[model samples]
Target: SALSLSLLSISRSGNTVTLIGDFPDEAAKAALMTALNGLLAPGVNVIDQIHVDPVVRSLDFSSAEPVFTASVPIPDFGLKVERDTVTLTGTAPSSEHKDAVKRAATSTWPDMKIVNNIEVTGQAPPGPPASGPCADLQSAINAVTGGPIAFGNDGASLIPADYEILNRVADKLKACPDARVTINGYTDNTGSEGINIPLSAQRAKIVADYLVARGVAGDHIATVGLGSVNPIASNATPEGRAKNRRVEIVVN
Candidate 1:
């Protein structure tokens, strides 16, 4: 995944400074960009035009030895400025920047944080096509939801029906020799955020393994755990939660 930063907050008192950016998923690239942009005051020393290469991307800084390398100290949840952005270089920010980065990024939405007068490209990977097998996949999802197959328990653990549903899905796949299957696992919002995320993944893997064991091509199966992000029912009720905890099989 590409790295990015969204500026959440900025403060400056004399020389001492603090700059915060959206979650640090890919490191401190975004935070640094924000600091640099603020310092350069875009359109002044540097033009707004900036390019970000995959490796050590450049940021606007003073001449001769512009020190905007990936070796600067991005403070926990924020970056601290010791010398009024004279020159900054560092490895990467610690993990603490995750939450702040997420909050900042989400708040900014279509817009993202700027680092060192550089705009962090926020382009996402192209999504699956809207027609053909993708549409059929959605129909299959509706079929499952419209039938006797309930959504199973929303907990991290799988219920007996979970395996049963995967078995049926594998059987269906066996009839279609040229098809590939993608299994997605989901959970209700009930457990710790940390555990729920991994649990969803485990559930999806379990379904994929069952398919492989049933003779589906191992290489043709893709599995993902969505955790609590996509819920099918109201989490307030047991049935709703149950409906949310499910493994969806998409064949193409």
Candidate 2:
């Protein structure tokens, strides 16, 4: 298959040669124009009517990283691609390889501008560090729940969304039967410690009940309420109060 596959028609009427076709790149169109001019009569005119395909104008970002990675194998080298530009980073073994990397990028993405910020260093760049067990799952849980089970000000009832989050946490716990977790509940500085503490404990109990209903072991979970204490957010603002009123799940 050709690098670019498109139709091109050329005709000569009187002293004029007309070109009409879909070109993948301007270079191909220009090459044809130059070739026709050389063979045509001195007094002849060539009318260009080439349509460049915009689809081939830029590199698709999804394929950019993989394509570059395969084309130019370099450690720690990365390509940050945008709509019509790519920023190259990391080191090359030599200036020649650096130039090759730039050329490879240009050849692959003709319409995209390449920013060659590659350095010519003689050493291989260090790779990423190793991750511990359950690191990915822990990160996912944190990202989804934002570190805790949040609640509204002075509210003990779990909303539909809160159940959805807990359902996921329960699934994780159920999957790992040996896992033991503590459910810590909290309340804002809105009332007496006696009232707040009980309210916090209620919140923790509710979470524990839900987890147990979701097929997790009741004995594996511990519930405690540290009401009006260790507030994650300041109790001075309404937003802070809402944030402080919550339950936390700590997996051990």
Model 2 per-residue lDDT tens digits across residues 139-175? 5676655433454343453334445665566666664
Candidate 2 segments exceeding 4 Å error = 1-136, 144-166, 189-194, 232-240
Q: Cα deviation of 196 in candidate 1 (Å)?
A: 3.3
Computed on alpha carbons, the lDDT of every model, listed in order, comes to 0.44, 0.56
Per-residue lDDT, model 1, residue 217, is 76
Against the true structure, candidate 2 reaches a TM-score of: 0.36
- For residues 1-252, what per-residue lDDT tens digits would candidate 1 score against the true structure? 223322234443223445443333334455555546545443333222223334432222222112222212232123322222311222222323333343333343223332322111221234332112233544665444443343544455432344455455455565443566667777766665335566667777776566667777768778877766766666665665566667666677
Best TM-score goes to which candidate?
Answer: 2
Error of 1 at 207 (Å): 1.1
Candidate 1 off by > 4 Å: 1-169, 175-177, 190-194, 234-237
The deviation in Å at residue 244 for candidate 2 is 1.9
Q: What is the lDDT, from 0 to 100, of the residue 151 in candidate 1?
A: 50
Report the poorest 10 consecutive residues by lDDT, candidate 1.
Answer: 63-72
